[PDB]
Amino acid sequence: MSKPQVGISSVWFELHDLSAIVRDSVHRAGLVPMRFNSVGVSKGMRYSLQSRELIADGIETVMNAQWYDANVSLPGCDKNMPGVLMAMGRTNRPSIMVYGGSIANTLATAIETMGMTVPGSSSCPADDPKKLVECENIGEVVKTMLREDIKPRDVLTRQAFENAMIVVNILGGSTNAVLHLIAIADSVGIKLTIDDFQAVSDKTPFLADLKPSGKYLMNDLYNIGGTPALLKYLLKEGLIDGSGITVTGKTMKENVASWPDFPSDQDIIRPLSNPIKPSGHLQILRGSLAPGGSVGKITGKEGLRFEGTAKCYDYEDAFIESLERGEIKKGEKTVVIIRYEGPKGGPGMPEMLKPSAAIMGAGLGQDVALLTDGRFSGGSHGFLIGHIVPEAMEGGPIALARDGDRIVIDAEERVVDLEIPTEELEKRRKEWKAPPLRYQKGTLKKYCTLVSDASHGCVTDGPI
């Protein structure tokens, strides 16, 4: 009739149907439910990052074409969450995310931290009947959001992203969170830079005893109070601000007041007294090889300086095959560059799992540093640096390095330097020629045309 219409956006690929429960709750609250579905992530890696744009574009399109008054989003898989939040920032109409439930991914905890979910959503397991009851009572949350006009730009403030980076830092830190939180902040009109991540990492310790290098899993947090208990603990220590409005109509502090604290005998989150590391893992490095920035998680076991000989590879398998031929030697310090894997070169910055694993399997973690304009995934006992800007496809210095060049990685200076003369670097750029875009037609052709560099979250509609 004249009731508000609530779009219910799912990202589904064929266990309860959470979307059907949301629909019945929205109807019971006096609103009109409108379920719709979106494609998502669910060689194949080259479509993953650009699927985030398809989610943001698709949901924005339906929300605006039909002009739904509010949004409930069920991203399902964790990898569908960023594009879901970007669509909310574009419409800026009252919206809420319902996490699918627990099944080291920190982004769902960070999204609840920012207040785009009811308390416990991100830590409640998918099995639990409490996940069903959350969706059974989401209708009144949406009606309250419409009554009090709680919009994504009211909730996703600059301080909300500060809390998100801190919580991510506390739990170990994701390098993908750099891409996604910058893009999500961009969608609500907030300028978030890689240097903002460095600032948090300098002042915030690492407290979560989590695998692969720790003892516990993120699923273990639910049994000691879940995400609300974690926020209560960080609020008690004064590390986060709880005064920000959320989708419930209350602040973070008000939301978590009624939830129980951590049990005193918990060893998943270290006390501030005894941190696993006094500063954050995530480090931003620039220098003559990555003047536009780069991203790496630094444990401290890599050492504080790595100077070595460059060996360059224009695709992932080229490195693995040169490794298997014994062209990378023990006792020598070698800096491996795997380039043309960036946003446009990949395309889509495909996550490479094999380079870091192959170096541990050969006992070279202390003799080999890894650099790329794309992404690494596994862990290495040496330097793992990605997101190097400009990428090789754009003609950055990473494309101009040659075998035999000296490269320095300094973790305290936070530079990756190509030890060649500036005149020579400019001469090499005058000889470089851009290869064609990998795809001349289709969705990847359009994505390559629009995508920004990694230091801007690879947003595709023009960084603010």
Author numbering: 69 to 82, 90 to 117, 125 to 185, 238 to 598
Give excerpts from the publication.
Here, we reveal the mechanism of AA inhibition on DHAD and the self-resistance mechanism of AstD, which is encoded by the self-resistance gene astD. Our structural and kinetic analysis of the mutant AthDHADs has validated the hypothesis that larger hydrophobic amino acids surrounding the active-site entrance enhance resistance to AA.
To understand the resistance mechanism, we determined its crystal structure (2.30 Å) by molecular replacement using the AthDHAD as a searching model. The main difference around the AA binding sites is the size of the substrate channel. Overlay of the structures showed that 3 amino acid differences (V496L, V497I, and I177L) between the 2 enzymes may lead to a more constricted entrance. We reasoned that narrowing the entrance, along with other mutations away from the active site, may prevent the bulky AA from entering in the active site.
